[PDB]
Amino acid sequence: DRVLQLKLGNSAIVTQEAANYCCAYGEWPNYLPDHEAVAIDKPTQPETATDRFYTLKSVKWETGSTGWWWKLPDALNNIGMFGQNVQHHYLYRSGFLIHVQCNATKFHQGALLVVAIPEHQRGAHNTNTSPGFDDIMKGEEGGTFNHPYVLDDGTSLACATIFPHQWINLRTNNSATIVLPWMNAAPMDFPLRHNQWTLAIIPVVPLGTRTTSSMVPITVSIAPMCCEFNGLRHA
Amino acid sequence: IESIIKTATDTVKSEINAELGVVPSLNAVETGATSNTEPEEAIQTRTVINQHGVSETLVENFLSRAALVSKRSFEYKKNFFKWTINTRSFVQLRRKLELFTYLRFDAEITILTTVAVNYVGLPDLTLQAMFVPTGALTPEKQDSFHWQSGSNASVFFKISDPPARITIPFMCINSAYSVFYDGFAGFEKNGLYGINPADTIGNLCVRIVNEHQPVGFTVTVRVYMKPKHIKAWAPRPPRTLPYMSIANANYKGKERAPNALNAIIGNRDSVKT
Amino acid sequence: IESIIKTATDTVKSEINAELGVVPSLNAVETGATSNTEPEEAIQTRTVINQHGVSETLVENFLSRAALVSKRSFEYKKNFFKWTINTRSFVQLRRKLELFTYLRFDAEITILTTVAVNYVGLPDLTLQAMFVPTGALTPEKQDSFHWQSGSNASVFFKISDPPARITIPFMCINSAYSVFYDGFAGFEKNGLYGINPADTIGNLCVRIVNEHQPVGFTVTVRVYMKPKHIKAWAPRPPRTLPYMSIANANYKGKERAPNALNAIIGNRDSVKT
Amino acid sequence: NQINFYKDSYAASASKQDFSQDPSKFTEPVVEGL
Amino acid sequence: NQINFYKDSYAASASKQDFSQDPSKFTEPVVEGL
Amino acid sequence: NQINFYKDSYAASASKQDFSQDPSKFTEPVVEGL
Amino acid sequence: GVPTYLLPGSGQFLTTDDHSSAPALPCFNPTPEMHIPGQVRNMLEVVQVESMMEINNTESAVGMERLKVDISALTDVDQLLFNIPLDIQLDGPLRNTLVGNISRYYTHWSGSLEMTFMFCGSFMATGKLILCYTPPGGSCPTTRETAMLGTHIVWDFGLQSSVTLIIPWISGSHYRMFNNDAKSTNANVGYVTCFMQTNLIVPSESSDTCSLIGFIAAKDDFSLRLMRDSPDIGQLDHLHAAEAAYQ
Amino acid sequence: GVPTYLLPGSGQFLTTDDHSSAPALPCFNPTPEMHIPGQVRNMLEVVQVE
Amino acid sequence: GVPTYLLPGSGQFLTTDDHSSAPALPCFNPTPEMHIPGQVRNMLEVVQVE
């Protein structure tokens, strides 16, 4: 039950110690049915070179660290053949797969809450001005939580288990794997302005040891599955 | 799986257990799952038939109440009332809608009005509420020509009568209302964060029909809304810190321990109190 | 045993009796029982068919009337009305509930209001009654933010209209209301005698919506209650001495022979009068 | 002819059709019959 | 006994007859059963 | 459920049940088919 | 002519009414429904999900360090670690959970609860605990000699790192109230408290201070009644851009 | 439109009325009934006791 | 006597109402219909013309 192997396209990920992978709200990603389609062009379904694991840049976890986040349609807009279909087409529809990797020795401790939030409308602290195109829309790198205790929008962290999530407890496992379906009010969506999901990992129990002082990075892989595009343009 | 639940569940009699290899009370919350320890397997129980109904905690019972959405008083001696429609104006209706992400309902709007002439009594008056959609031209004067429109939906009512009630269907162009929106509104590089153009309804203009007489007035208008036929998706955690504005979700926090920024729950003396 | 009685019983013809060994008229009340001497066995009777119906002395006919529970007048120039709910305020409804120990009914509440401006006439006014349960926050001002609540049950009515009527179900956490309670309320050593926390309903707050104008008012509110669907257990003797307070059952007694402490029935000259 | 269009059952009228009666619990409470 | 004489279907009353329920999407979201 | 107790037939409500449609009198008015 | 007299209670605006209303937009056609994942039809599907709680709500604990409790090695035989006041209505650790925020809109509650503890120490660390619950008759227990007599569980730190303590529904009545008095007979629930069974033992290389995270949810017989207004939101502060809709 | 004229005696509050009333608490569920001993259903069971 | 309470929203003049109305001219007989060419029954027959 601990050992697991995923394969999508020409990619594969192998792990030995990992708790089960969860499906968000009991669902599995699929294509668009005929009785729900709206646009009348034939969609472009490439089915390879857009269904792979794309790894992001690793971040270093320290004692004073306080959390990280990402925006899932936006983090992949300049990576590979996913980032080229997005710029030429006008609509898309897809579902993702997240895989978070962080390991240590037998003598370390710590815990991470790996949660996935739909429509995470952020908020700025102690002002009236809304945030702009800056401080959101950071491609392939993620902002750091200023006040992670209230998820930087006022809602409490203590009820953030209502979203699909797993835990990375360094005593037990070193991996977390979440499958996300298409979730939006509309059947397709413009990818350069709206972001559906928001991956966010938050260190609840900070790490600590008395062996040595060594780097411990955290790595995130994302795999868009069952993606399809429509409405061809120039750039 | 899916099943019809009318009342709460019941408990069956328990015996003593000394089984090896089986542990009900241990689990692992690192999987993201929730515990499934029945009380039959933790203590010794009796058999209890349970008649407690669960029909009051439904979503259509939790939401469908008449809540205030607008209140504004205008003097009659800009001579009328105009309100771009939002549900973020009053903080007690708002926090109950912030629990969900998507919603699909049919409202039911009641306009309640009272007057206070500033002979302290009053004769009969007549009102007019007109629902201007987006795009259409809104009036800017009491006797503008935009009030003669036969196409906009209007309603006339009096002060002496019971208040006006209509109903309004599901108006969005998508299949649900987006309470939250993590995107922009325009195709340009600099737009407005947090709003979608798929949820903009329009204006609601209210005037008083009678010509100004010898005496000035003071008219106070209240608008209530009750949802109907509610479907709801994706529950969310509730808002804890107080609100700060309407166009966004900023947060400030109170100064002292209840609902402060570094403390939601007020302090205690020690952990072993 | 159990039987359905629609009308009163009848009498059958009696003959002369000189039977030995049989005595109908003797009994023993030391057993705690009641006499069972039929009139057929004490005198000589005829046969009488009886049509007298007994349908008016039912418990649901004896109780279900509209009785006053509250009356309080507030001036408008603490600007509103607040009443922690009890049924011990007026002594004529109270004494009819003191006959039983347990009760289970559904009330039906009518709020009747009248006003007297202190131009002696008056324009139209609008009221608001809100039912605050226990635990919830009660307002302390006419225009407090606790009146915008969509969750508390409210009702708006006018002076010119027929009065407001609602109905309220059986609200207790037990299976009956305890009219009497021979216990305390808290787990501490010193609590309050004679009250249970299983019977506390909450507040009922009434304000007037219109803004204060040139002229002051005087509003008088009456609240009636009619029980419905009554079940009653354990009859008790009626109260004889007058009441003294609400939180308990003290007694003082009048000074002179009717309903005095040492005499309930007024005096007579001699026993052989 | 009673009438209600409300969805709740406690909103109805009263009823006066309950003529069952057991008087021999207050008058004859003893065990051994006389 | 519901009642409406309006031609539109969204003008009706509410309904409280929807007792279907699937709680094991929030509490047991995993794939491999325990 | 429509309702009228008036003796005249023009006193009734409107009706929205007329979905018949012949669009090819304005768009294809010609004689010889293409 | 149908003779109709009008009974009292006519023309009133009851906010919980249920009647048909006149359509403002005739012959409107709504957009067709689409399968959006994750539909909730009953608010008891949300209170069965676990959610953490602020055991360490003492002062000079800034931020998200209020969610965990620190345990360490010690020199005496038996020692207390913490205790939780089971008061949803008052300002306690349970106010900010999912079973806390949802059930303050209602005023009667009836069911069972469960508490789930996750140990976040290192792999080389061992130890045992005891987690007991006492019914509300007396005061809080001080030592382990008067606290073993309640409903307890004894937990060993093993491969899998969670335990579950069921708080059973012991009550005379059918429901309980969210009363403002803590020591009322229909509102006082009990006391949950934790002691050390054996010691917390670590090697020289692991960190001495380990942590615990406390979860809470409801079971499948939980029930709620008589909806009211929430005591949480109580400020009356006027907010920016309110008059912008009112030109 | 149903033609209804209203007869005298309308809008009066007779204290012995018997009509249905609007519910203030929708979808409420009362506590179930329990057998409490000694139920009286008629006030002629009390006047037959010495 | 039929007991009728009147609910809110009574006596209002909604411009999009649909109810029967009282005839002003009783026993009137309209002129019979004649086939006039070019009848439109739906406003989507007009927006399909170039």
Q: What is the DSSP string of D1-34?
A: ------S-GGGS-------EE--TTTS---SS--
Q: Does E10 touch chain G (CB under 8 A)?
A: yes
CB contact under 8 A, B182 and A121: yes
Gap between the Cα atoms of G193 and G79, Å rounded: 11
Gap between the Cα atoms of B201 and G24, Å rounded: 14
Domain ranges of chain C: 1-273
CB contact under 8 A, B3 and E22: yes
Q: Which residues contact A34 (CB under 8 A, 6 or more apart)?
A: none
Our measurement of the distance from residue B81's CA atom to the centroid of its chain's CA atoms, rounded to an integer in Å, reads 22
Gap between the Cα atoms of G144 and A202, Å rounded: 36
Q: Neighbours of D (≥3 Cβ pairs closer than 8 A)? A: C, E, H
- At the topology level of CATH, where does B1-273 sit? Jelly Rolls (2.60.120)
Element (H, E) at A95: strand A89-101
Degrees, nearest 5: CA angle G61-G67-G72: 80
Gap between the Cα atoms of B22 and B261, Å rounded: 45
Return the structure tokens found at A221. Answer: 């892989």
Q: Quick check: B87 and B105 in contact, CB under 8 A? A: no
Q: Which of G21, B177, F13, I15 is nearest to E10 (CA)?
A: G21
Residue found under tokens 């131009």: C119
Q: Quick check: C97 and C227 in contact, CB under 8 A? A: no
D12-21 burial, b if ≥16 CB within 10 A, otherwise e? Answer: bebeeeebeb
Q: Quick check: B2 and G135 in contact, CB under 8 A? A: no
Chain H positions with Cβ closer than 8 Å to F = 1-3
Q: Quick check: B22 and B37 in contact, CB under 8 A? A: no
CB contact under 8 A, E29 and B3: no
Return the structure tokens found at C219. Answer: 């509003």
Q: Quick check: B190 and B70 in contact, CB under 8 A? A: no
- Nearest-neighbour CA in chain C from H1: distance (Å): 24
3-class SS of residue G224:
strand
Q: Identify residue A40 by its one-letter amino acid code.
A: I
Strand runs labelled E in A174-223: 175-180, 197-205, 217-222
Q: Which residues contact A217 (CB under 8 A, 6 or more apart)?
A: A58, A59, A60, A61, A102
Q: Which of C134, G64, G81, B32 is nearest to A178 (CA)?
A: B32
Residue found under tokens 């005023």: G107
Gap between the Cα atoms of C127 and C124, Å rounded: 10
CB contact under 8 A, H4 and G1: yes
Backbone angles phi, psi at B213, to 5 degrees: -105, -155
Q: Which of B116, B120, B134, B123 is nearest to B209 (CA)?
A: B123
Q: Which of B141, B75, B84 is nearest to G241 (CA)?
A: B84
CB contact under 8 A, G175 and H31: yes
DSSP state of C164: E
CB contact under 8 A, G166 and B34: no
Of the residues C115, C142, C209, C211, the best mutation for testing chain B's interface (the one with the most B CB atoms within 10 Å of its CB) is C211
- Nearest-neighbour CA in chain E from G45: distance (Å): 5
Residue found under tokens 């008219």: B219
Question: Strand B81-84's sheet: what is its strand order?
Answer: B81-84, B202-208, B127-133, B153-156, I13-14
Gap between the Cα atoms of A158 and B199, Å rounded: 31
Method: cryo-EM
Q: Quick check: C60 and H40 in contact, CB under 8 A? A: no
Q: Quick check: G94 and G190 in contact, CB under 8 A? A: no
3-class SS of residue A221:
strand
Gap between the Cα atoms of B202 and B137, Å rounded: 11
CB atoms near residue A5 (< 10 Å):
9
Q: Identify residue G5 by its one-letter amino acid code.
A: Y
Measured between alpha carbons, how far apart are the two ends of chain A, in Å?
46
Residue F5: closest CA among chain I residues belongs to which residue? Answer: I20
Residue C230: closest CA among chain D residues belongs to which residue? Answer: D14
Our measurement of the distance from residue E9's CA atom to the centroid of its chain's CA atoms, rounded to an integer in Å, reads 18
Return the structure tokens found at G53. Answer: 């709680």
Return the structure tokens found at A110. Answer: 């710590």
Max CA-CA distance within chain E? 54
Q: Which of A100, A99, A120 is nearest to A111 (CA)?
A: A100
Of the residues B56, B57, B65, B165, the best mutation for testing chain C's interface (the one with the most C CB atoms within 10 Å of its CB) is B65
CATH number at residue G179: 2.60.120.20
CB contact under 8 A, H29 and B56: yes
Beta bridge partners of A167: A113
Gap between the Cα atoms of G117 and G155, Å rounded: 10
Q: Quick check: A100 and A111 in contact, CB under 8 A? A: no
Q: Chain F neighbours among E 1-30 (CB < 8 Å)?
A: 5, 7
DSSP state of G8: S
Q: Neighbours of F (≥3 Cβ pairs closer than 8 A)? A: E, H, I
G173-191 burial, b if ≥16 CB within 10 A, otherwise e? Answer: bbbbbbbebeebbbbbbbb
Gap between the Cα atoms of G221 and D5, Å rounded: 32
Question: Strand A165-169's sheet: what is its strand order?
Answer: A68-71, A197-205, A111-118, A165-169
- Nearest-neighbour CA in chain F from H28: distance (Å): 32
CA distances from A115 to A182, C144, G117, H21 (A): 17, 40, 19, 50
Q: CA torsion H38→H41→H42→H43, rounded to 10°? A: 50
Gap between the Cα atoms of C64 and C225, Å rounded: 9
Gap between the Cα atoms of A45 and H4, Å rounded: 67
Backbone angles phi, psi at A91, to 5 degrees: -125, 155
Q: Quick check: A97 and A179 in contact, CB under 8 A? A: yes
3-class SS of residue C40:
helix
Residue H20: closest CA among chain C residues belongs to which residue? Answer: C167
In a 10 Å sphere around its CB, with 0-12 CB exposed, 13-18 middle and 19+ buried, how is residue G25 labelled?
middle
CB contact under 8 A, C34 and D16: no
Return the structure tokens found at G89. Answer: 């209505």
Degrees, nearest 5: CA angle G119-G120-G123: 100
Domains in chain A (CATH in brackets) are 1-235 (2.60.120.20)
CB atoms near residue C136 (< 10 Å):
22
Gap between the Cα atoms of B80 and B103, Å rounded: 32
- Nearest-neighbour CA in chain E from F1: distance (Å): 5
Q: Quick check: A10 and A53 in contact, CB under 8 A? A: no
Query: Could you tell me the residue range of the domain that residue G3 belongs to?
Result: 1-247
CA contacts within 13 A on the Cβ side of A143: 15
Which region holds residue G111: left if phi is over 0, alpha if psi is between -120 and 50, else beta? Answer: left
Residue found under tokens 């990920």: A13
Beta bridge partners of C107: C168
Gap between the Cα atoms of G234 and B242, Å rounded: 9
- Nearest-neighbour CA in chain E from D7: distance (Å): 7
Return the structure tokens found at B31. Answer: 């999987």
Beta bridge partners of B225: B67, B109
Gap between the Cα atoms of C180 and C103, Å rounded: 11
CB atoms near residue A78 (< 10 Å):
13
Contacts of D28 in chain C (CB under 8 A): 33-34, 36
Gap between the Cα atoms of C141 and C139, Å rounded: 6
Which member of H25, H31, H42 has the closest CB to residue C174? H31
